[PDB]
Design a protein around this ligand. Structure first.
Ligand SMILES: Nc1ncnc2c1ncn2[C@@H]1O[C@H](COP(=O)(O)OP(=O)(O)O)[C@@H](O)[C@H]1O
Ligand SMILES: Nc1ncnc2c1ncn2[C@@H]1O[C@H](COP(=O)(O)OP(=O)(O)O)[C@@H](O)[C@H]1O
Ligand SMILES: Nc1ncnc2c1ncn2[C@@H]1O[C@H](COP(=O)(O)OP(=O)(O)O)[C@@H](O)[C@H]1O
Lengths: 545, 545, 545
């Protein structure tokens, strides 16, 4: 196709058309769309910034790994920035929009979709960009693996198993640290060469049956997916949250059925009980009584699953402290809410669960519930499935808090300390108030840290509110940095600002990242700007936000 | 000082003297030795290869981080190769010897020795190259932390905590994977700049009390040592087993007192019981009943702790199958021996321990022992301390199997499958026999993989056996690669050979590693040859073994 | 001389000795000191930071312009950084200390001292780095020019006329903006070539008498010092506050005797009268009734001229609001104090003076005084000489507020609005209080802006207070930048911080300045780091504060 709305930097319309005809000749016109449930792949959907920002020139869906290698070849020939996606469902981080306009979004999921291998004795699977969590689930159920191996799913199930893992997301089971469960990844580099990490570099020995296969299609050696380190430099991490390569395949470890499961809910009556609760959770997480990643939800998070804002009030301004208590009562929930789960034989569960209850009993008016003790529509019923690896679509109901809601995640990290968590909550709560927004968030409990997801929801068509959201977001980044907290992940417009936060010793961390990226991507064609890392041909003065 | 035995590549004697006076003027003459319990820092002690190989030109001991920076400056000025060590105690991997002769060994432990911080609520410590495991142990005992926080120690306690962790060593408690317990490292790069990884890049906010401190001496932000990922590319792994930078500081996560501990021994009668034992260990490790990294030791390993070869036989050739049985009997051990430990409240221990015993009960003649049930000198008494983080010097007795023994480790990885373990064991036992050596080894049980340490012991003054040792080693490397197994770590003379083994898709892995190294070390002065990775100014033709 | 405490970056001790013998052979040993009233030229005197910072390696005093050229030649040969000073008296901005250690301080005032020309019909003088204000004063008195031409002096008379003017200082007469009174500068560039700006580039026509003179010693054409622009790019400003060249000569415009002079003092009773006073000053300055640069001083500034802190109180903590009032009373001054002066025939003076008094009459309890109406020791008696171009040493008494006081200037710019002045004053007063220091300062009234000098005084030997001083300074810098105010000049340790504040559109300003500097100084030997501007061979990671 012929005339895009936006062309990549320095490229003519003629160059653009020559390229597209070349890609069209490789992957078929059906896998190449030019911009002149069903996630968009062309633009930021959770519009926060405006037009001209994050708009692709074309979407290209490779049929396979070779196609990715030919498309890289052509980006290097023509100097065309690529933006690689697996699914593009996470609006809030900007969905599939490219950081620089004119990029070709590389839809890896449309055709490279295969569950490559589910290995029972090793307790791992091997996956392509396109396998969503739902797909891996159906894959297990149709092969009888449901009662031998379990999954680990993020709050919504349509995300991509490999996508989520390379961006380092978190799940709610004992295997919740996705990135930490990977072993043996296949990558297409900026030069177009194929590379496999860890024991993935140790080739499967020759055998009659696997002779002549292209590299991509070759099997892996036996320890590829059982031991992540291989030998020498462990380079895997240069591929999480980076623009250093295009991830084509990845092995993720699966937790075998524990032969015992019980999910639960602990309600904390007062807004201020977060402090003692977090002090209670600390020793228990560090001492292993708490098996999975346990979450601490704010009342409106559960509230919004169950109903939009108009369904709880007419106010257009933020609900008050009073109303929040009334919503809590209405649903039988607390002001803050702890969800977690017990895994294993009954005899073990029991002891953990008597220790847990025992510890949270020191908070007045605390209340303990199993799924069964709660309403049909309850979050616990839904989360009962989430913490045993079963994927759902339920919790997506909160996105619709406001009418034409769009949301963004402000995601700082806090210590596992009541004092620290109350301090971080205060800073976010003031600012959310100052912007006219309800504060909505969760804390997901890591072993020695807490991931705090603040869900800023607003009206995608309101010029005034989007600017308040832009002002909120950048002010929270600074406030949080002035209190020694940093974000673990953000949307395309805050990458630069968040990377500037990690400036110890005059930006040593980013300088060093710059070196690695110009070395391996001399034309700077693999996602310029991802995480605020820019190749030399992209002037900081021109591109940073 | 004036005239070294060996000078670094292309450097004159005049250049060399100029440099050395410069370094002497920076760190004092007492910290600079020229080569013209108490580990050697000048040469490979476990002589395998011959003279001219792995011989330093000088040892240099920085007083602090500034001193490492100035020494890097002068290596880039003069083009002098540095070989950075922490302790240099691991003969068998080549102790502190440099891969290229003429290098200056950088002894980082002599002066940069401090336990920087032991934080209890966060359950981490922060350390300098010089803190040995014994040192961190005494640090805890002198501040009352012994009944709050425990360590994780490798079979010998004199190694370096950070050294062991960047090299990716393994311990025998639940926090056994050292590298995976790190968070927040300080690195001096080849350009001379200081760099802190993950949340170590997010600076501590300004305060009156920490103003004006040098970068090196600044505190870290609060999540520095609690969340390892930070934001963007996770680059940490580029510093493990690499020549990418000089590690100055590191934070390691400490496991709090579990309020319950029981160590144990399960003796396996027959040489062939390894196969069923490994099939039994598989589900139990994967289902979490086995809490620590359990070990499976061969009879001579325990034999050798207790006594030299002469003390069990006059024979000069390898002991036979029959004699091995007799030795087993003599000590009350099996042919293979499983060591492990139960952590936690009694109610929990008990259920794990009934599941463990139950499962190993299917192996005829199996026998279960607690420390107390065994002789004063037993290994289990020693290992009872090892599996609770208490360091010792006991197991070092085996190095003396033979008279003027030196040892080397042949270190392949196997599946956690009886079948695979028996196959690897066969390949290693034949080859050791063909070289006239006793087979001595362990398997340390990872979650989905086993680390197989074969301990090749020989006479360091015997020309004929050293060569058989070199022949064993390189044949094992190939044999193992022909069966799909790679090594996780080796001595200076096998580094090129083992890297060549990870050659999938025509050496992609090492090619990509060469790009990163030349980018960040344009003069190639940081440890040329580590892991088989060579900067461009070191001809492969000239330097590879 | 042989062995300095600190050597410039990358330079050997042998190189250093070679250079120094070369310079010694050019200017004589009496003009070259090696570091192994009477201002120091070797280190920061108003110690704030610590050792190793801002320490010269040698002081070099050229005999003349040729000598500066040869010294530039040798800095480019050896790559040695030069730090050019004129006088070095301004402790508080760091006196003559170099921004990078190992630099050679180039003392230009010791020998290049001459009053080159005082031209009456043109009403200008032409000067070398060494002419201090006292010196130009005595020059005028010895040639009868005292009743024809007047000077313009900064609060202390010992600074350098050209030095003060390239740094853009301010005086208290109608010709108060020093930099704006220059015309025709002679510069030695980093390549070593001599350059004369504006009509200084248009050469004096040949004549018998000026044939054969070196460039440096040639006369200037007739408009050289009467029209500053010349033709084409006006480049003059590249030499103010910059590291673009070494200023050798400069022409400054002198204001002829106005035939009428009356200096005065307007005392403002209350701490809050600053607000109405600044609103009163606004129209009057803008409408030209206020002839000179009037000043508005805080009570302790005048207090401190007259006596140390101990002489007003025993207190070690900051004096209170109440005590300030009592001090005001004791001296017959207000809380704030406005100094100014009427120039010109009596008929004109009188009308300005009735308009001035009239306007300030709306501030209750206001009091008007001429010199004669005040005590012998009063500030107005001193400032009566200051506002007619007569230099003094009097006001230097305040430096001794505290015992072993050192001071630093925090120098922001504010609008000429009572509201803005009170807001800036608040921000600075809180912070000084939080550091335990007395707030001391002035506002010097530009035509449409105010220069606010906050004088931070502290004990140069107190580790704890120096750090509070470093904390104050950097917090003030940010606070002020968060309120839209920038600093106009700072000490060596805040240069990077203050430049980072002028970062509109991702640091465009400094990026563009980096381009000009690398173009003209390819070896980066002219004052690396001045104003936060660093040549390419000075890693930002390594050198920024
Ligand atoms: N296969 C891949 N290779 C490299 N980067 C990838 C790959 N897949 C995803 N990414 C990255 O992950 C980011 C998140 O996108 P995505 O895969 O669409 O999320 P999700 O599956 O959580 O909806 C993309 O912006 C891109 O940076
Ligand atoms: N601080 C460090 N920075 C970089 N590499 C290091 C550092 N310390 C040790 N090493 C690496 O670790 C290897 C193992 O050495 P060493 O510390 O002496 O072992 P141990 O502590 O097991 O005795 C060295 O050869 C080098 O590869
Ligand atoms: N001739 C000159 N050429 C270039 N820069 C100069 C020259 N003289 C002074 N400077 C600059 O002016 C700054 C102020 O120094 P100085 O002359 O010692 O101050 P003062 O006269 O106020 O005591 C120096 O640090 C340097 O930045």
């Amino acid at each position: 196709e012929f005339r895009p709305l936006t062309l990549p930097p320095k490229l003519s319309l003629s160059d653009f058309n020559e390229f597209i005809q070349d890609i069209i000749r490789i992957v078929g016109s059906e896998n190449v769309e030019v911009i002149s449930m069903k996630p968009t792949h062309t633009h930021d959907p959770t519009h926060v910034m405006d037009q001209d920002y994050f708009l692709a020139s074309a979407i290209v869906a490779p049929r396979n790994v070779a196609d990715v290698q030919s498309i890289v070849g052509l980006a290097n020939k023509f100097s065309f920035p690529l933006w690689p996606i697996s699914i593009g469902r996470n609006s809030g981080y900007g969905g599939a929009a490219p950081r620089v306009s004119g990029s070709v979004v590389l839809d890896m999921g449309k055709n490279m979709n295969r569950v490559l291998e589910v290995n029972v004795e090793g307790a791992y699977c091997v996956v392509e960009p396109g396998v969503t969590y739902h797909d891996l689930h159906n894959y297990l159920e149709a092969n009888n693996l449901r009662d031998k191996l379990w999954l680990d799913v993020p709050d919504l199930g349509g995300g991509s198993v490999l996508g989520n893992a390379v961006e380092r997301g978190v799940g709610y089971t004992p295997y919740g640290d996705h990135w930490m469960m990977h072993s043996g990844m296949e990558v297409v580099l900026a030069n177009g060469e194929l590379l496999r990490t860890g024991m993935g570099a140790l080739p499967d020995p020759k055998r009659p049956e696997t002779m002549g296969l292209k590299p991509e299609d070759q099997p892996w050696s036996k320890i590829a997916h059982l031991f992540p380190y291989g030998f020498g430099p462990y380079i895997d991490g240069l591929f999480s949250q980076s623009n250093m390569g295009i991830v084509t395949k990845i092995g993720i470890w699966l937790m075998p059925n524990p032969g015992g499961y019980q999910s639960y809910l602990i309600t904390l009556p007062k807004d201020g009980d977060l402090k003692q609760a977090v002090d209670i959770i600390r020793p228990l997480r560090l001492g292993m009584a708490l098996q999975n990643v346990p979450t601490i939800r704010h009342i409106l998070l559960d509230a919004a699953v169950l109903g939009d804002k108009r369904s709880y009030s007419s106010r257009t301004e933020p609900l008050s402290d009073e109303e929040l208590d009334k919503i809590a009562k209405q649903l039988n929930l607390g002001r803050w809410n702890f969800y977690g789960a017990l895994y294993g034989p009954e005899p073990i569960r029991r002891v953990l669960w008597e220790t847990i209850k025992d510890a949270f009993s020191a908070i007045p008016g605390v209340k303990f519930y199993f799924p069964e003790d709660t309403p049909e529509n309850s979050v616990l019923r839904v989360r009962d499935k989430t913490m045993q690896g079963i994927p759902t679509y339920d919790e997506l109901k909160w996105i619709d808090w406001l009418p034409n809601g769009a949301h963004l995640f402000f995601s700082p990290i806090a210590k596992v300390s009541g004092e620290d968590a109350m301090m971080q909550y205060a800073v976010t709560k003031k600012r959310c108030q100052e912007a006219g927004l309800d504060f909505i968030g969760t804390f997901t409990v890591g072993m020695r840290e807490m991931h705090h997801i603040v869900c800023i929801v607003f009206n995608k068509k309101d010029l005034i509110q989007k600017r308040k959201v832009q002002w909120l977001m950048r002010t929270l980044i600074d406030d949080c940095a002035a209190n020694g907290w940093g974000e673990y992940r953000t949307h395309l417009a805050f990458m630069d600002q968040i990377m500037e936060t990690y400036n110890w010793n005059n930006s040593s961390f980013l300088r060093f990242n710059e070196v690695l990226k110009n070395a391996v991507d001399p034309n700077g064609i693999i996602a310029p700007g991802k995480s605020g890392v820019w190749p030399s041909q992209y002037s900081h003065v021109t591109w940073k936000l």
